[PDB]
Coordinates of C-alpha atoms and ligand atoms in Angstrom, one line a residue:
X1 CA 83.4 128.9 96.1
X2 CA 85.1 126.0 96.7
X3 CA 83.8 122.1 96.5
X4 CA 81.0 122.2 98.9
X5 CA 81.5 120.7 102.2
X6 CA 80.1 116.9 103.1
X7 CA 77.1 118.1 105.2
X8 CA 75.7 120.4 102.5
X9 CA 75.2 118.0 99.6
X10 CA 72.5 115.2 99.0
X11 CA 73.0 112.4 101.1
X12 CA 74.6 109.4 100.0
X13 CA 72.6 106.4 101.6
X14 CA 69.4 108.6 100.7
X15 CA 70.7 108.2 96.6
X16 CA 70.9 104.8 96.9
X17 CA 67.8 103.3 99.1
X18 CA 66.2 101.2 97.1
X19 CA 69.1 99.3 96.4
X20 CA 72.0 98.9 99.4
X21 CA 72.4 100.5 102.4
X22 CA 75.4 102.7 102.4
X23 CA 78.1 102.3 105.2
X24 CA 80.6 103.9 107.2
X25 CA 83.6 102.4 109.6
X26 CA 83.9 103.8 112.6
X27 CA 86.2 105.0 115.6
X28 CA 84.0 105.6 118.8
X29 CA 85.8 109.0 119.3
X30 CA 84.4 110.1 115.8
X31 CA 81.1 110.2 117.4
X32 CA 80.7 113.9 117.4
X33 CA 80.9 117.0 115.6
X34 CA 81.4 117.0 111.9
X35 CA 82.3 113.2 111.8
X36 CA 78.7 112.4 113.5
X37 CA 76.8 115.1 111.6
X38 CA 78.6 113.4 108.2
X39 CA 77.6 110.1 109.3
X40 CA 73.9 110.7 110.2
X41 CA 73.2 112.4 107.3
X42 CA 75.1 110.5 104.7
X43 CA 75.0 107.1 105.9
X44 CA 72.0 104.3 106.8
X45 CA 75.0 101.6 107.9
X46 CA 78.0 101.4 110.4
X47 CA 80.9 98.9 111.3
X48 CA 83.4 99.3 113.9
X49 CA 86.8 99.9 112.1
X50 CA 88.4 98.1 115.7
X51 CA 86.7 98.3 118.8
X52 CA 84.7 95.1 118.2
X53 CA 87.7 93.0 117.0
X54 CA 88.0 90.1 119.4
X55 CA 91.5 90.7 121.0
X56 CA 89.5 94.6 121.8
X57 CA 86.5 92.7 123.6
X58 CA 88.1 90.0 125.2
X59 CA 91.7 90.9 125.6
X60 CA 92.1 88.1 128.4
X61 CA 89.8 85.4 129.1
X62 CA 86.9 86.7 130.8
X63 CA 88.0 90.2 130.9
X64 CA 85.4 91.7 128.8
X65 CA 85.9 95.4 127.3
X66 CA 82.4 96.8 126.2
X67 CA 82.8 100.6 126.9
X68 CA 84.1 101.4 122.9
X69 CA 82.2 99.1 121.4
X70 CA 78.8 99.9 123.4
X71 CA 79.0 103.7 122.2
X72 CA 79.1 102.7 118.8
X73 CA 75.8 100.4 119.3
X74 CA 74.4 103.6 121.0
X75 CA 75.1 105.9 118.1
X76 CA 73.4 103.1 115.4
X77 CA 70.9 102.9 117.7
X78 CA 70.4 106.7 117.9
X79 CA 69.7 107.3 114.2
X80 CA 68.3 103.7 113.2
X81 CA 71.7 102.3 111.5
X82 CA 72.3 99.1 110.7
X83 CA 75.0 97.7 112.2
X84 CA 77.8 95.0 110.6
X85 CA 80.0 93.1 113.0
X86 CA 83.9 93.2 112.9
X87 CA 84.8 90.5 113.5
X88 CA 83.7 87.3 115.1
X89 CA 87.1 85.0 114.0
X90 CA 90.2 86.0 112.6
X91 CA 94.0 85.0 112.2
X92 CA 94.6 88.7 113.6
X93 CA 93.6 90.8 116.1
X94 CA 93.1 88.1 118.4
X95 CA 94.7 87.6 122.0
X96 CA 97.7 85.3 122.4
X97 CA 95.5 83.4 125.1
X98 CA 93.4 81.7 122.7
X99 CA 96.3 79.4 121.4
X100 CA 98.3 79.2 124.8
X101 CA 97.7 75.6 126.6
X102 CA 97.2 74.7 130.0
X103 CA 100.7 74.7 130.6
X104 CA 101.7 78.1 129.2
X105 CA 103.0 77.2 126.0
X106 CA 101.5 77.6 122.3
X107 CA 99.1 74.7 121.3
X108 CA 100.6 74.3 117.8
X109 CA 104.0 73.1 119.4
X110 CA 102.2 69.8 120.9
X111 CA 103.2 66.9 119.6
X112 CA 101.1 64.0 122.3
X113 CA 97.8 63.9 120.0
X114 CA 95.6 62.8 122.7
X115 CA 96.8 66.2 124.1
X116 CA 96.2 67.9 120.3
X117 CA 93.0 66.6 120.6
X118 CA 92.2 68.0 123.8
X119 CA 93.4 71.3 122.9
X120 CA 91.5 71.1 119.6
X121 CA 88.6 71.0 122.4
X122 CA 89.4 73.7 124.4
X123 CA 90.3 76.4 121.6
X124 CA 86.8 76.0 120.3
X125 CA 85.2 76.0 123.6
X126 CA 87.2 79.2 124.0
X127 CA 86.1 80.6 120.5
X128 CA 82.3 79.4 121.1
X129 CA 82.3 80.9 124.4
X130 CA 83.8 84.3 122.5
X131 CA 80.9 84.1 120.1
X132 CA 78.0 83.3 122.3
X133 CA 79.1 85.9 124.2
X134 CA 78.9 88.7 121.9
X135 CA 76.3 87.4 119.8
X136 CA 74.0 87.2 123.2
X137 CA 74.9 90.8 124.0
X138 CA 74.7 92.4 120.5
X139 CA 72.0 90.0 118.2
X140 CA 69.2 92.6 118.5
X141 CA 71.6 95.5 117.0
X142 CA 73.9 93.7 114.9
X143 CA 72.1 93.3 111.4
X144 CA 75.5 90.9 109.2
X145 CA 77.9 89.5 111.2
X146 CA 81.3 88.5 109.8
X147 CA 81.8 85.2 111.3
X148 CA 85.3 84.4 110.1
X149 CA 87.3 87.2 108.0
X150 CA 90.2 86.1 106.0
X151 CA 90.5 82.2 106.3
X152 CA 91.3 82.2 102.5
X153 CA 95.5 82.5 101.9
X154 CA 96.9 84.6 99.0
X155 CA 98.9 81.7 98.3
X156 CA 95.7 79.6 97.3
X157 CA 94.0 76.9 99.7
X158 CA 93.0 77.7 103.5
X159 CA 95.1 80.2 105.3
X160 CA 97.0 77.9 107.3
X161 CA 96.9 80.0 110.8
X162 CA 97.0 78.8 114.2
X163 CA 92.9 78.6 113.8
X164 CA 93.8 76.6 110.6
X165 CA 96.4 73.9 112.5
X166 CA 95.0 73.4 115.6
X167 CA 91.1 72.6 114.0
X168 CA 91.4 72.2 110.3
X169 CA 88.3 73.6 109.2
X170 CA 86.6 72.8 112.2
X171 CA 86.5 76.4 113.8
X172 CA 84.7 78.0 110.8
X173 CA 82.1 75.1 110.6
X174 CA 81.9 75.7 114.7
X175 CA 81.7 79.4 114.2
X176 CA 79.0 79.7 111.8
X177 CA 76.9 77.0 113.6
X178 CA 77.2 79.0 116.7
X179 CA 76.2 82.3 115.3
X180 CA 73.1 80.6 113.8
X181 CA 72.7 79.2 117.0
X182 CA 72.7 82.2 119.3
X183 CA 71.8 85.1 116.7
X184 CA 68.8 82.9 115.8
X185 CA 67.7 82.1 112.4
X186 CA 67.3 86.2 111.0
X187 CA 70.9 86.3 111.7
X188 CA 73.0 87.0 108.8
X189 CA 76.0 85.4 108.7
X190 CA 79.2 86.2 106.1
X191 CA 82.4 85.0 105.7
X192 CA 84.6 88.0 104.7
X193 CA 87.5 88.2 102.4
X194 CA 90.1 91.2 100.6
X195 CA 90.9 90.6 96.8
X196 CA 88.0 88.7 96.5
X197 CA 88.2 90.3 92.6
X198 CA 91.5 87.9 92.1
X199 CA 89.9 84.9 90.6
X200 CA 91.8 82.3 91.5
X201 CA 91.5 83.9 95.4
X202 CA 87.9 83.8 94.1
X203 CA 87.6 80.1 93.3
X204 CA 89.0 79.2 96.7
X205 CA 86.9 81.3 98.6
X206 CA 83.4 79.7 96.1
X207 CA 84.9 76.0 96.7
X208 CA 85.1 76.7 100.2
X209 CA 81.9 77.6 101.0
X210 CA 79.9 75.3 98.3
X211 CA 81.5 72.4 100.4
X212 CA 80.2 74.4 103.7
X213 CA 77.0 75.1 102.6
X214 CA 76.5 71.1 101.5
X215 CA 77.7 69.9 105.2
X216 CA 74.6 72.4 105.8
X217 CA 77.2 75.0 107.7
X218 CA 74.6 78.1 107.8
X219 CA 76.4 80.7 105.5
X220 CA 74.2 83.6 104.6
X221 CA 76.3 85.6 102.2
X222 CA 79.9 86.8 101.2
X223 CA 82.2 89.9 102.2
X224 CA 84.5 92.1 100.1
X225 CA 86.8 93.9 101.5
X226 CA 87.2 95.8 98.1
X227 CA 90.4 97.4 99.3
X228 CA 91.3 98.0 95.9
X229 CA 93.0 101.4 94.1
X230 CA 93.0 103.9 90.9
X231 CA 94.7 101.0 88.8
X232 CA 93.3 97.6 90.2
X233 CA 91.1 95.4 90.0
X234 CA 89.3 95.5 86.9
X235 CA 85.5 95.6 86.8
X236 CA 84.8 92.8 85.0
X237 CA 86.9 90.7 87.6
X238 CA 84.7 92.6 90.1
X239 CA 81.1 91.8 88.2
X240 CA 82.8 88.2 88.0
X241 CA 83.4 87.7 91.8
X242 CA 79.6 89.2 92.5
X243 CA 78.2 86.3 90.1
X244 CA 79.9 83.7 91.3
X245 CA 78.6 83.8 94.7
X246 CA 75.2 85.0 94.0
X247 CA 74.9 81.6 91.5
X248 CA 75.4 79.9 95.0
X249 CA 72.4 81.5 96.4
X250 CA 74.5 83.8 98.4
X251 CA 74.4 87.7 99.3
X252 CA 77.4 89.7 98.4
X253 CA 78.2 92.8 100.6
X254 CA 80.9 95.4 99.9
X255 CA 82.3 95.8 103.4
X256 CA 85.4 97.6 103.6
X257 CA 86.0 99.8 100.3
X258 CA 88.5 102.7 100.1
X259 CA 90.4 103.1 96.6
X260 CA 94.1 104.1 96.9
X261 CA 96.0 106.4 94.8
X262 CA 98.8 104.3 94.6
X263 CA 99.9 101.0 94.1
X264 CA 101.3 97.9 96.0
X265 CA 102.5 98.6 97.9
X266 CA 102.1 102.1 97.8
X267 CA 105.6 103.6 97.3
X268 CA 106.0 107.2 96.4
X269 CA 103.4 108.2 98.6
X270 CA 102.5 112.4 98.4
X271 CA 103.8 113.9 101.1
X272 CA 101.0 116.3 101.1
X273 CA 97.3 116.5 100.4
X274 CA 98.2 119.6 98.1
X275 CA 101.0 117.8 96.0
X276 CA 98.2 115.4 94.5
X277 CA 97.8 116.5 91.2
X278 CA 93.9 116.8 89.9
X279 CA 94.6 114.4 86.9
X280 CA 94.9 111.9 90.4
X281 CA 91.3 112.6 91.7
X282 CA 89.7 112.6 88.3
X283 CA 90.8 108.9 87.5
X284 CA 89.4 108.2 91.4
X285 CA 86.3 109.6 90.0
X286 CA 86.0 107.9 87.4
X287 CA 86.8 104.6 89.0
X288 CA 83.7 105.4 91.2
X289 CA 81.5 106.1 88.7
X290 CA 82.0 102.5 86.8
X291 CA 82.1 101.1 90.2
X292 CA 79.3 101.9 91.3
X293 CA 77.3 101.7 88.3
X294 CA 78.2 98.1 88.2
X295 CA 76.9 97.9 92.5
X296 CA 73.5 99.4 91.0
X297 CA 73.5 97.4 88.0
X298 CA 74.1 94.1 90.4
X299 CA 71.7 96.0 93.4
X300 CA 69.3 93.0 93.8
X301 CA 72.5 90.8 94.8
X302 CA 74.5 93.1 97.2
X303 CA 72.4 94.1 100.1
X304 CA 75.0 96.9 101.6
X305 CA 78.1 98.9 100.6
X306 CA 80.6 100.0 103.4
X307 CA 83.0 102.2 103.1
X308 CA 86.5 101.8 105.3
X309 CA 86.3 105.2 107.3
X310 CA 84.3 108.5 106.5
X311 CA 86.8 111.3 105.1
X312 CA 90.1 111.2 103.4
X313 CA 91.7 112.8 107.0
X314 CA 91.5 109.3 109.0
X315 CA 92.0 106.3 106.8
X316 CA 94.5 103.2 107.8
X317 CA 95.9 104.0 104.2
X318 CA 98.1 106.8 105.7
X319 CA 99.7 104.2 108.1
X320 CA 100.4 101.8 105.5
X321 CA 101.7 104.8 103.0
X322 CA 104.1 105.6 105.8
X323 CA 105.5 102.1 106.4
X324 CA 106.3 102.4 102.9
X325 CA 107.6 106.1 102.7
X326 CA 109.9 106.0 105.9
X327 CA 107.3 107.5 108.1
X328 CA 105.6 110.3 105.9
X329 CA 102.8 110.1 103.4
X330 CA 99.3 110.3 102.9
X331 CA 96.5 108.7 100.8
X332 CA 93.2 109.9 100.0
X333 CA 91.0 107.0 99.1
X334 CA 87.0 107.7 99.5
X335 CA 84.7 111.0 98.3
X336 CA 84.9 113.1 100.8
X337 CA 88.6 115.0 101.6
X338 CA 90.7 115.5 104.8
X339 CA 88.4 119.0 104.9
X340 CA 85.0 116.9 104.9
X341 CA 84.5 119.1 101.5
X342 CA 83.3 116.4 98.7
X343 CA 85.7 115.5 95.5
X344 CA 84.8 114.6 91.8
X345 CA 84.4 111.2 93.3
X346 CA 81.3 112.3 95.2
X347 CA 79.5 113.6 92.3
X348 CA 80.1 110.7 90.1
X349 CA 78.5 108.3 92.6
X350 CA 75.5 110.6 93.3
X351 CA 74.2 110.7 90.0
Ligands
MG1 MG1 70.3 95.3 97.4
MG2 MG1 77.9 107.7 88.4

């Protein structure tokens, strides 16, 4: 027979329980069927890949859209899940409103610093309001919450956003403070990045948060992304991110992971799942199998491992390879294929 399909094989989160739960992001649509039965037997974790993003829940002020995000709280709920939060603050995926001043026009056009300073005040009333809103409604299901995702540029120093210009550092010191101050203190609060593994990205990310952590900003633990492919990043620069944070008395999750076939950015995308050649999926697998023996080998500093979707058939990899293939092209990044049947990658993880 074939490779046997996802719901038939030992169970992923099972393999690794006494050492990080195992996690899965999610569409609410992908709530039933073979998705769900995948996801209750193989995983003990679940994020919401967008339907808790803030410009989904609050798409204009005080216009609150639950429904999406609600079933995926029912489903955790359901079959005992924990449940990471995506995301509380973030340079994307936020409504236009937020920066828009009384007037109608964008708050990082002012030039009248009394007026700066007043908007200062009302776009972190606004994002304090946001969080103790969602915090209140979600704190007793919500088990890490990623405060602020992605305030780090590629660059090097802060991402200088509209967050960045209008509050300097100010709206990640207000956002962790009133996480801690709603979720209560068992709330666990991270500041998630991607390319965490580059170490100079690295460096920026540890200075940052040693200075928070001394202004006594309550920072729990770290996020990456791990969006990261066949050819990069190495494992020792991963091992060497891990440390780094965990010398700060931090947790380290794995958040987001899926590992590309390609490059960056991934040009000569297949076309088809059948045109990837085998010699493709057995350096995936053996990329998993390193990779995770270094999670289990650093298991008493990582608390939780998330993958970026379930099966190879719904993965925001596809869009990106066909913004960079002229509208066709497909990846296949995680152990499990676009049939739910498991890969070499699967059985390199589970052992
Ligand atoms: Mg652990
Ligand atoms: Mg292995």
């Amino acid at each position: 027979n074939d490779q046997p399909f996802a719901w038939q094989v030992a169970s992923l989160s099972e393999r690794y329980q006494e050492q990080f739960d195992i996690g899965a992001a999610v569409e609410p649509y992908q709530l039933e069927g073979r998705q769900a039965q995948i996801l209750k037997h193989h995983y003990n974790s679940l994020v919401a890949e967008n339907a808790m993003k803030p410009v989904s829940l609050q798409p204009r002020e005080g216009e609150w859209n639950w429904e999406g995000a609600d079933k995926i709280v029912e489903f955790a709920r359901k079959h005992n899940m924990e449940l990471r939060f995506h995301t509380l603050v973030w340079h994307s995926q936020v409504p236009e409103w937020f920066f828009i001043d009384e007037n109608g026009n964008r708050m990082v056009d002012e030039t009248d610093p009394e007026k700066r300073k007043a908007n200062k005040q009302l776009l972190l009333e606004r994002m304090e309001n946001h969080i103790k809103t969602v915090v209140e409604r979600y704190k007793d299901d919500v088990t890490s919450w990623d405060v602020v995702n992605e305030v780090i540029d590629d660059d090097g120093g802060l991402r200088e956003s509209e967050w960045y210009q209008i509050t300097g550092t100010d709206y990640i010191k207000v956002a962790f403070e009133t996480a801690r101050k709603y979720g209560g203190e068992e709330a666990k609060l991270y500041i998630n990045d991607y390319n965490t593994e580059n170490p100079s990205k690295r460096d920026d990310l540890y200075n940052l948060v040693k200075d928070l952590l001394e202004q006594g900003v309550p920072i729990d633990g770290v996020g990456h992304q791990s969006h990261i492919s066949i050819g990069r990043p190495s494992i020792e620069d991963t091992r060497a991110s891990f440390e780094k944070f965990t010398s700060l008395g931090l947790d380290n999750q794995v958040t987001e992971l899926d590992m590309s076939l390609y490059g960056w950015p991934p040009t000569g995308a297949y076309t088809s799942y059948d045109d990837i050649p085998e010699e493709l999926f057995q350096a995936q697998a053996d990329r998993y199998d390193q990779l995770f023996e270094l999670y289990e080998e650093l298991s008493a500093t990582i608390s939780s491992v998330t993958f970026w979707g379930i099966a190879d058939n719904h993965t925001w990899l596809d869009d990106r390879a066909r913004e960079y293939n002229n509208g066709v092209g497909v990846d296949a990044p995680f152990v499990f294929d676009h049939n739910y049947r498991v890969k070499p990658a699967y059985w390199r993880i589970i052992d």
